[PDB]
């Protein structure tokens, strides 16, 4: 999970 | 065992089979046409192209920082996001997207971001100091050693540790160009896998 761009 | 249950497993596998195909195309610096991907990847589920391509293009822009640019027709070429020069192939897995993730994390904590704040963003994505992530490699060594000599980052003491953009990072992109890539992707059209009834309706 990347919490920069939620993806 | 269920057919619609085995369907999304086939789509989810064609997403990861097209992505790993385009990476072979970016490493060779060739052009990709819609006819190639249909005939040599998704030969069976061709009419699903708007969704397997859309979910593979999106799985490149954000995982490896590779952009599928249509030359406009139906021809595409593979470049790096924000027009950088580094990918890490010295030709398997590009480390550009992780770089661009680290950059935008400092870009939001101001001029500099603490080493703590950086690891906490990297830990939520499954990348941990002292654990060789398969696609990215050793994080601590790649962050510190690799991106310091490449002049993409700076790593100095407290007056605790912290990261700042480097000379090569400021030369090839900007704080405003990264923070808008974050906004454009946070506001993307989210593709949803089709059901079997939906996928058959489109014929």
């Amino acid at each position: 999970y990347i919490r920069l761009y939620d993806y | 065992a269920d057919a619609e249950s085995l369907f999304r497993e086939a789509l989810s596998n064609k997403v990861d089979e097209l992505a790993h195909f385009l990476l072979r195309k970016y490493r060779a610096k060739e052009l990709v046409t819609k006819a190639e991907m249909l005939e040599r990847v998704i030969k069976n589920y061709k009419r699903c192209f708007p969704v397997i391509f859309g979910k593979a293009s999106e799985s490149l822009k954000m995982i490896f920082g590779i952009d599928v640019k249509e030359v406009d027709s139906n021809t595409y070429t593979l470049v790096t996001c924000l027009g950088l020069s580094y990918d890490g192939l010295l030709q398997i897995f590009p480390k550009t997207g992780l770089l661009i993730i680290v950059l935008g994390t400092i870009a939001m904590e101001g001029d500099s971001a603490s080493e703590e704040e950086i690891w906490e963003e990297l830990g939520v994505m499954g990348v941990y100091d002292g654990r060789e992530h398969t696609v990215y490699g050793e994080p601590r060594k790649l962050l510190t050693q690799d991106w310091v000599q490449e002049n993409y980052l700076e790593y100095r003491q407290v007056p605790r540790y912290e990261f700042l953009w480097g000379p090569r990072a400021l030369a090839e992109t900007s704080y405003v160009k990264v923070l808008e890539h974050v906004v454009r992707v946070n506001a993307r059209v989210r593709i949803a896998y089709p059901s079997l009834r939906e996928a058959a309706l489109l014929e």
Side-chain angles (χ1 to χ4, degrees), chain A, chain B residues 1-26 28-39 41-46 48-68 70-71 73-90 92-115 118-130 132-155 158-159 161-176 178-202:
Chain A
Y1 182 54
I2 37 201
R3 62 171 180 178
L4 206 38
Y5 16 64
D6 75 316
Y7 174 90
Chain B
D2 181 30
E4 282 194 354
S5 175
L6 293 171
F7 190 49
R8 291 181 60 262
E9 264 187 26
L11 300 177
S12 159
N13 275 283
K14 284 316 196 179
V15 164
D16 284 80
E17 189 184 344
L18 177 58
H20 285 264
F21 178 67
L22 299 180
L23 290 196
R24 195 170 315 116
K25 277 288 194 181
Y26 163 85
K29 309 167 184 181
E30 296 188 17
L31 251 49
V32 194
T33 175
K34 186 179 175 182
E36 277 192 64
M37 294 170 294
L38 293 189
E39 178 57 23
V41 170
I42 56 169
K43 185 169 182 56
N44 314 302
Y45 325 84
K46 290 191 177 64
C48 295
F49 178 79
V51 179
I52 322 182
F53 179 76
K55 280 189 161 294
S57 294
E58 168 179 303
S59 290
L60 259 64
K61 181 172 190 180
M62 314 170 63
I63 304 185
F64 321 95
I66 308 299
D67 183 74
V68 176
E70 183 179 19
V71 308
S73 184
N74 296 323
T75 305
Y76 306 83
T77 181
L78 304 183
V79 299
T80 25
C81 269
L82 302 177
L84 308 200
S85 59
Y86 163 83
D87 46 52
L89 311 175
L90 61 87
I92 307 184
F93 288 146
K95 315 184 177 189
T96 292
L98 182 57
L99 181 71
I100 300 191
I101 282 165
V102 177
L103 295 181
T105 306
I106 318 171
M108 294 208 176
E109 285 263 301
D111 290 9
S112 66
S114 176
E115 145 179 302
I118 294 298
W119 280 123
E120 186 173 1
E121 174 86 21
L122 266 66
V124 180
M125 15 141 35
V127 178
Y128 305 79
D129 181 11
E132 182 180 25
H133 187 106
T134 66
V135 181
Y136 295 138
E138 215 296 321
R140 183 99 151 185
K141 175 219 163 184
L142 176 78
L143 258 171
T144 298
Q145 334 299 340
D146 288 70
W147 294 342
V148 158
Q149 272 71 215
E150 299 284 354
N151 296 318
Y152 271 104
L153 295 173
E154 289 195 16
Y155 188 62
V158 207
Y161 278 68
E162 47 183 356
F163 289 85
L164 309 90
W165 289 50
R168 184 180 171 183
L170 289 157
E172 302 179 7
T173 190
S174 72
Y175 264 48
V176 182
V178 170
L179 290 197
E180 203 198 25
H181 176 256
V182 168
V183 163
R184 200 196 343 272
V185 178
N186 266 292
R188 68 197 182 278
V189 175
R190 265 155 191 78
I191 316 109
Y193 284 105
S195 72
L196 219 47
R197 164 84 245 110
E198 297 167 332
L201 178 60
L202 323 179

